Design a protein around this ligand. Structure first.
Ligand code: TI7
Length: 242
């Protein structure tokens, strides 16, 4: 069921880094990783949490649909793309923390805790501030746990409406061409050691789906592009994408 290929470590060490990639072949129900231990170690989800947060906001009516405009609050932040109006699509695309912090405040502690337990999401622990627990609170999730959550979303098996799940999968759209479609979300965790980057999602092919979840050490923001680059290089090596 699970296979470890330690040779894949070269994808990380050749960039003076360390990390884990986890792949899941949906047709064959088989998983692959370079590091079984790190595949099950739990980290802050950071902006990968925008996936469950979006689902909860939509199902509760906090967000009406993917067109609703969340007006910039007029507070100049250091990320230029955050200083503007957003909808769910652009908020996901630009990982707009302040929009999602307001979602969480409107969701509230009780409903957020209950929905994460319903999702079986990570350690399901929202200890900390309701508007930042996924950045510096107690919640944790492993790469293998990301896969389990994403598989439910893919199959519309999470305990929210089909509509909510369809909308979030639309907002996760990252890349599409004649060969494959990638739906995914990046993450960047800096408030608690070790600093890491995430990329989680799946690759849709004509006749199969491959789920993936990776994290890697990220001491500096200069390496953020490696999250996607390394993942796609692993996918190419395994002949999942050309
Ligand atoms: C939080 C943050 C701090 C320092 C540098 C970049 C970022 C950031 C901000 C928004 C999106 C992303 C990203 O990866 O997509 C990264």
């Amino acid at each position: 069921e699970w296979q470890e290929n330690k040779s894949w470590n070269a994808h990380f060490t050749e960039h003076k880094s360390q990390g884990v990639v986890v792949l899941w072949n949906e047709n064959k129900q088989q998983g692959f990783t370079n590091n079984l231990k790190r595949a099950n170690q739990a980290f802050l989800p950071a902006s990968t949490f925008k996936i469950p947060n979006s689902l909860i906001a939509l199902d509760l009516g906090v967000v009406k649909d993917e067109h609703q405009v969340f007006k910039w609050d007029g507070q100049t932040r250091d990320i230029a793309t955050w200083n503007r109006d957003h909808n769910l699509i652009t908020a996901m695309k630009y990982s707009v923390v302040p929009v999602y912090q307001e979602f969480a405040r409107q969701i509230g502690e009780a409903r957020m805790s209950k929905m994460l337990h319903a999702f079986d999401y990570g350690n399901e622990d929202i200890s900390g501030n309701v508007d930042s627990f996924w950045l510096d609170g107690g919640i944790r999730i492993s790469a293998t746990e990301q896969i389990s959550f994403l598989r439910k979303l893919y199959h519309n098996k999470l305990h929210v409406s089909e509509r909510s799940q369809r909308i979030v999968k639309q907002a996760m759209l990252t890349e599409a061409n004649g060969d494959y479609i990638i739906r995914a979300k990046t993450g960047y965790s800096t408030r608690i050691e070790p600093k890491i980057g995430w990329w989680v999602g799946w690759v849709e092919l004509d006749d199969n789906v491959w789920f993936f979840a990776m994290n890697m050490d990220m001491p500096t923001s200069d390496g953020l592009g490696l999250r996607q680059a390394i993942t796609k290089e692993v996918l190419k090596q395994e002949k999942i994408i050309p």
